[PDB]
Design a protein around this ligand. Structure first.
Ligand SMILES: C[As](C)(=O)[O-]
Ligand SMILES: [Fe+3]
Ligand SMILES: [Fe+3]
Length: 294
């Protein structure tokens, strides 16, 4: 009752498209206007598209697509659905936009997204990554998407050096991507995802704690959190990061290698993302996190 984990309508203005493991959120801005939030994985294009069209009879009414960060599982749908969305404008940070103009970077994103295709699956036709209708948004920028939707852009680096989150001040609703970590569905706690910069990761969570009380907290994976899970989310994510650090120091101090400890974390936590993150990459991300924290 504190996490909404079924695709479909979540609120009067808000729907979850696709699978809850890598969801795309649909906002109704008006009678003839909509926005998407989060960019998904490429293999989900036809599923997300099918869901979309059952809510939006005219896809030319999809006007904005908000993107938290450049990781392959948060922008993989863009080249494949943007062509079907003639009036969409993609909103993303400056650093996120940069990645889509680099071929070495685009090659990685496309290669990862391809590893996720189902047996015998075919991707739609992709427009050019460097032709996406992007508009760079800045830290603190107010996005007036509609008469009842004003969302603030907030820089939230640490998980990645480009990550931003989008805060609907009216609805107390935060789209937070992976900045709080991965929500542990069985245990109800955040699993830290410190893959770039520990100091920035914690600083972002400090700032996000100072927002007005959250009523809805929407990460990049797992659905919508509400009640105390939203109100306490940023603070709990901070606590869980410090906790992992303290426990890492214990385990290392007893002689456990980063090799064994990363494999242990991989076994403990890889299960939730098995269907959208190759296990070798989850393991490597665990290893990088433990290196950063150490
Ligand atoms: C692919 As990930 C662990 O940054 O959500
Ligand atoms: Fe990520
Ligand atoms: Fe992610």
């Amino acid at each position: 009752m504190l996490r909404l984990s079924a695709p479909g309508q979540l609120d009067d203005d808000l729907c979850l498209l696709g699978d809850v493991q890598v969801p795309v959120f649909l906002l109704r801005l008006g009678e003839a206007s909509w926005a998407l939030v989060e960019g998904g994985i490429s293999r989900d294009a036809e599923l997300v598209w099918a869901d979309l069209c059952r809510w939006v009879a005219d896809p030319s009414q999809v006007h904005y697509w908000l993107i938290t960060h450049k990781h392959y599982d948060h922008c993989g749908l863009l080249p494949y659905l943007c062509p079907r969305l003639p009036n969409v404008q993609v909103l993303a940070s400056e650093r996120t936009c940069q990645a889509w103009k680099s071929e070495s970077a685009v090659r990685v994103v496309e290669r990862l997204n391809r590893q996720l295709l189902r047996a015998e699956q075919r991707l739609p036709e992709a427009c050019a990554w460097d032709a996406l209708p992007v508009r760079a948004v800045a830290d603190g920028e107010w996005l007036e998407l509609g008469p009842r939707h004003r969302l603030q852009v907030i820089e939230a680096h640490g998980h990645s050096d480009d990550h931003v989150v989008f805060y609907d001040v009216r609805r107390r609703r935060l789209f937070c991507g992976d900045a709080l970590g991965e929500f542990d569905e069985a245990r109800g706690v955040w699993r830290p995802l410190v893959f770039d910069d520990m100091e920035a990761y914690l600083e972002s969570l400090e700032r996000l704690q100072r927002l007005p009380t959250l009523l809805q907290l929407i990460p990049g994976h797992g659905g919508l959190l509400r009640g105390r899970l939203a109100a306490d989310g940023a603070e709990s994510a901070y606590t869980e990061c410090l906790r992992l650090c303290r426990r890492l120091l214990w385990r290392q101090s007893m002689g456990e290698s980063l090799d064994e400890l990363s494999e242990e974390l991989h076994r403990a936590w890889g299960g939730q993302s098995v269907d959208f993150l190759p296990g070798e990459l989850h393991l490597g991300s665990m290893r990088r996190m433990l290196e950063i924290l150490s």
